[PDB]
Amino acid sequence: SGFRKMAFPSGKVEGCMVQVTCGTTTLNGLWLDDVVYCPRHVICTSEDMLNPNYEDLLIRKSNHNFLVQAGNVQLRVIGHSMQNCVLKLKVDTANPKTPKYKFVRIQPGQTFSVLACYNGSPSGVYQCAMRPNFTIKGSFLNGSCGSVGFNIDYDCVSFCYMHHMELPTGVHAGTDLEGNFYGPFVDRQTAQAAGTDTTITVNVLAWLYAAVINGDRWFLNRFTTTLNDFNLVAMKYNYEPLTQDHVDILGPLSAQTGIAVLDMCASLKELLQNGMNGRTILGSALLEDEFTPFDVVRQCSGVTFQ
Amino acid sequence: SGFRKMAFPSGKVEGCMVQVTCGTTTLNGLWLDDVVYCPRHVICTSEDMLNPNYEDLLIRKSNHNFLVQAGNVQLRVIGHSMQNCVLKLKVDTANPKTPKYKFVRIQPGQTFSVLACYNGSPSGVYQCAMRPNFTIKGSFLNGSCGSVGFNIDYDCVSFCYMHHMELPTGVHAGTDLEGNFYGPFVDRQTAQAAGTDTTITVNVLAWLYAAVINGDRWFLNRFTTTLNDFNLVAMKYNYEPLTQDHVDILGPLSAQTGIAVLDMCASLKELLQNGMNGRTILGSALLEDEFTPFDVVRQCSGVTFQ
Numbered sequence: 001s002g003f004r005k006m007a008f009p010s011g012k013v014e015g016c017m018v019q020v021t022c023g024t025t026t027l028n029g030l031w032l033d034d035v036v037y038c039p040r041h042v043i044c045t046s047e048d049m050l051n052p053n054y055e056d057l058l059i060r061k062s063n064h065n066f067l068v069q070a071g072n073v074q075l076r077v078i079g080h081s082m083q084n085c086v087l088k089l090k091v092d093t094a095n096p097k098t099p100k101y102k103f104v105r106i107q108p109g110q111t112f113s114v115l116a117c118y119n120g121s122p123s124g125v126y127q128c129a130m131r132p133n134f135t136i137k138g139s140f141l142n143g144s145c146g147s148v149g150f151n152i153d154y155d156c157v158s159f160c161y162m163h164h165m166e167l168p169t170g171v172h173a174g175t176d177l178e179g180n181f182y183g184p185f186v187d188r189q190t191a192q193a194a195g196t197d198t199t200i201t202v203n204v205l206a207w208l209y210a211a212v213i214n215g216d217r218w219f220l221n222r223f224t225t226t227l228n229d230f231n232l233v234a235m236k237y238n239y240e241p242l243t244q245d246h247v248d249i250l251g252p253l254s255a256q257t258g259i260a261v262l263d264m265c266a267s268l269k270e271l272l273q274n275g276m277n278g279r280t281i282l283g284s285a286l287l288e289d290e291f292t293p294f295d296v297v298r299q300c301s302g303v304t305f306q
Numbered sequence: 307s308g309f310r311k312m313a314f315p316s317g318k319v320e321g322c323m324v325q326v327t328c329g330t331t332t333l334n335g336l337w338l339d340d341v342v343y344c345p346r347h348v349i350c351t352s353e354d355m356l357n358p359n360y361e362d363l364l365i366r367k368s369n370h371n372f373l374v375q376a377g378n379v380q381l382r383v384i385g386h387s388m389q390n391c392v393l394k395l396k397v398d399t400a401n402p403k404t405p406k407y408k409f410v411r412i413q414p415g416q417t418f419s420v421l422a423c424y425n426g427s428p429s430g431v432y433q434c435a436m437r438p439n440f441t442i443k444g445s446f447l448n449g450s451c452g453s454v455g456f457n458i459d460y461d462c463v464s465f466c467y468m469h470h471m472e473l474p475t476g477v478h479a480g481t482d483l484e485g486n487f488y489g490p491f492v493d494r495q496t497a498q499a500a501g502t503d504t505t506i507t508v509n510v511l512a513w514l515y516a517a518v519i520n521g522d523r524w525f526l527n528r529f530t531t532t533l534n535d536f537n538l539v540a541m542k543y544n545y546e547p548l549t550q551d552h553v554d555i556l557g558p559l560s561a562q563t564g565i566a567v568l569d570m571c572a573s574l575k576e577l578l579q580n581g582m583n584g585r586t587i588l589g590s591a592l593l594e595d596e597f598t599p600f601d602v603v604r605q606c607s608g609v610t611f612q
């Protein structure tokens with residue numbers, strides 16, 4: 001037993017990380033088949049960044065201005081194009097380590113692993129959630145752009161995120177691998193508001209179920225509630241409203257634990273209105289919302305990939 | 307910026323995971339050069355487990371009783387031997403993916419990544435600490451034994467842990483790769499006490515420094531203290547005593563932040579005596595002790611491996 005914020009194994013994505021340099025700027029690209037994907041702001045200088053005209057900037061540039069290095073062998077660039085906020089550099093050589101892959105735009109509240117990279121090499125891997133406000137709470141320094149977020153379904157890597165920037169509040173923003181930002185952001189160095197964020201109610205419930213599964217039962221109480229009654233208290237506390245779709249997604253966890261979803265809503269309610277009295281749940285003093293129902297079931301039944 | 311419990315990239319260890327089966331029991335082995343390492347309790351039946359005579363049990367067994375599968379190709383076993391609580395199965399074939407590696411016995415308070423595996427395939431990766439009481443707080447189900455914990459120094463994988471069992475309190479216990487347990491444990495199904503655990507003071511300090519580095523300063527106060535005065539309050543709160551060796555290890559963080567170590571001890575003190583008033587630090591409502599000074603510096607300056 002036990003419950004941990006576990007990342008996906010990262011080997012298949014490691015084989016895809018390359019270094020991309022344009023002028024003075026270096027960041028990471030993703031090399032799949034004969035294509036390297038990277039944030040288009042690799043073409044900007046530190047002045048250009050304040051308000052780049054990307055089409056004019058890319059115009060200046062030629063294939064030979066893009067230095068793409070895979071380990072200590074780089075690739076010949078034969079083609080370049082701009083798709084939304086990513087560059088696609090067409091290279092000489094198909095990546096012999098390309099995995100089975102998909103490009104996915106994830107929904108708010110879903111989770112993914114991030115392989116933080118610098119200069120084309122892995123620094124580490126961590127798990128995170130797409131916040132309801134299309135930000136993530138990551139660990140990114142200069143050089144980390146082009147690092148990617150992904151899920152794995154057995155042998156298939158679903159790329160869902162590429163890192164582009166940090167917001168004034170220290171959260172992080174990026175695109176999907178078609179270069180469309182999650183959320184209302186643009187790739188320029190201006191002040192940008194993410195919305196009010198909200199807690200992923202269905203994930204908080206899934207985590208309380210993981211707790212019960214792992215023997216942590218103290219917060220279970222004697223009340224029940226109704227959806228409408230529960231959401232009245234959710235909105236006071238910026239929890240995203242709970243729906244029958246969410247109830248159904250919790251169905252398997254509800255039946256495994258023998259605890260009605262609305263009975264667990266009642267327990268969450270008293271936690272939201274009364275705090276934790278200095279208690280912990282699965283080792284946390286906070287209500288944790290970065291685990292989906294599918295993440296809980298995965299962990300608790302030992303799902304593998306290889 | 308931002309700060310996350312980040313695991314090491316796990317690709318080099320993935321290439322070393324194999325499935326080892328003896329009788330009805332299946333768990334993971336580590337295949338390096340022409341040797342597979344795995345927990346010796348792979349030879350036990352569920353009766354044998356209550357008090358195994360391992361030498362008598364291993365005696366019965368022959369090389370052909372050990373089924374070792376690497377993906378869908380297994381290996382011919384030509385040799386078997388028992389070293390402390392691990393079996394070494396000598397195989398036909400040197401692992402073509404063996405990385406540069408070392409076997410290390412880690413000190414309490416150090417951290418490592420765990421690649422949780424089932425049936426020889428990766429489920430996920432997470433970071434953890436060797437508790438002062440030589441347990442870890444992991445996520446392990448049946449089948450997970452033989453999963454390994456490791457650090458990476460550029461290209462070198464330092465194996466430090468192999469998982470063997472779960473304790474009555476839900477924590478986890480295991481050996482180094484020479485098969486000697488961390489802590490006072492034996493590999494039999496009896497009730498076993500880990501000691502009183504204690505918080506890794508030097509790591510809590512390193513994490514408060516990571517907080518300051520990342521702009522979280524609210525807990526910084528106006529007091530200082532002395533080592534002896536600080537430890538009086540540590541022991542009340544089961545914190546492991548702070549020494550000048552620890553002060554020196556925090557030296558770099560102290561000088562980067564311009565905050566005396568004893569001034570940060572003073573801040574930790576008031577946190578221990580006054581709680582967090584419902585505040586958070588780097589997103590946690592608890593004092594976090596699973597980051598070493600070296601983990602903090604690594605993260606905040608972007609150290610890579612590949």
Ligand SMILES: *[C@H](O)[C@H](C[C@@H]1CCNC1=O)NC(=O)[C@H](CC1CC1)NC(=O)OCc1cccc(F)c1
Nearest residue numbers: 140142143144145164165166168187189190191307
């Ligand atoms: C690329 O590697 C880098 C990743 C950043 C660096 C610090 N933490 C990160 O996540 N991205 C940028 O440097 C980005 C340039 C891209 C958008 C065109 N600029 C950025 O992140 O600036 C931060 C910021 C914060 C508040 C206000 C502001 F104007 C700019």
Ligand SMILES: *[C@H](O)[C@H](C[C@@H]1CCNC1=O)NC(=O)[C@H](CC1CC1)NC(=O)OCc1cccc(F)c1
Nearest residue numbers: 001446448449450451470471472474493495496497
């Ligand atoms: C091997 O895969 C397994 C890993 C365990 C399974 C559940 N969570 C884990 O971490 N190890 C064992 O199953 C181990 C057999 C080894 C020691 C000879 N037995 C075990 O972990 O039993 C747990 C336990 C807890 C309290 C009291 C008790 F007697 C036994």
